[PDB]
Amino acid sequence: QLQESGGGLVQPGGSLRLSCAASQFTFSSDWMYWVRQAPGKGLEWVSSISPGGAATAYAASVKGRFTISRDNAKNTLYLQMNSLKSEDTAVYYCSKTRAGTGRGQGTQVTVSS
């Protein structure tokens, strides 16, 4: 089980920090991902993080302004998002695959304004 949180209403150029709590003890050995779904669009990969945190990857549209990180002792995944724009508006999910299978209920980021 996974539970995203931290979403909200923000102004263009603002920022938010998303959190994702994982209930299974397997979190420490899992690749984890942030994916998002904007209005009327499909799921889109945002970023990826290796089990130990040593390898990360980012969609080109968020490179340099988003940071994925994880705390395995707290079984929590994080996403720090900066310089948010209206096109960043979406439901954000954490997932165990880049395609978004095994996601929580998501948390909505709304940017307008």
Author numbering: 3 to 115
Kindly provide excerpts from the paper associated with this entry:
Here, we present and characterize a panel of nanobodies that can be used to functionalize designed proteins built using CC dimers such as protein origami. The nanobodies were selected to bind to different CC modules representing the edges of the designed tetrahedral protein. The crystal structures of five complexes consisting of CC dimers and nanobodies show that the nanobodies bind primarily to the noninteracting sites of the CC dimers and, in addition to complementarity determining region 3 (CDR) loops, strongly rely on the nanobody framework residues for binding. The most extensively characterized protein origami cage, tetrahedron TET12SN, self-assembles from a single 461 amino acid residue polypeptide chain consisting of 12 CC dimer-forming modules adopting antiparallel or parallel orientations (APH2, BCR2, GCN2, P3-P4, P5-P6, and P7-P8).
The P5-P6 is a representative from the designed set of orthogonal parallel heterodimeric CC peptide pairs. In the crystal structure of the Nb34-P5-P6 complex, the asymmetric unit contains one molecule of Nb34 in complex with P5-P6 and two additional free Nb34 molecules involved in the crystal contacts. The structure of the P5-P6 peptide dimer agrees with the proposed design and comprises four heptads with an NINI pattern at position a, which together with the pattern LLLL at position d form the hydrophobic seam of the P5-P6 dimer. Nb34 interacts with both chains of the P5-P6 dimer, mainly with the residues closer to the C terminus of P5-P6. The CDR2 loop contains a stretch of Ala residues which, together with W33 on CDR1, create hydrophobic contacts with the core residues at positions a and d. Additional interactions by CDR1 include a cation-pi interaction with K20e and a hydrogen bond with Q23b. The arginine R100 on the CDR3 loop is involved in a network of interactions with several residues on both P5 and P6 chains (N16a, Q11c’, and E15g’). Finally, non-CDR residues on β-strands C’ and C” and the C”D loop contribute to binding. Compared with other nanobodies, the binding affinity of Nb34, measured for the tetrahedral protein TET12SN, is rather weak, Kd = 21 µM, while the affinity for the isolated P5-P6 peptide is likely even lower and could not be reliably determined using ITC.
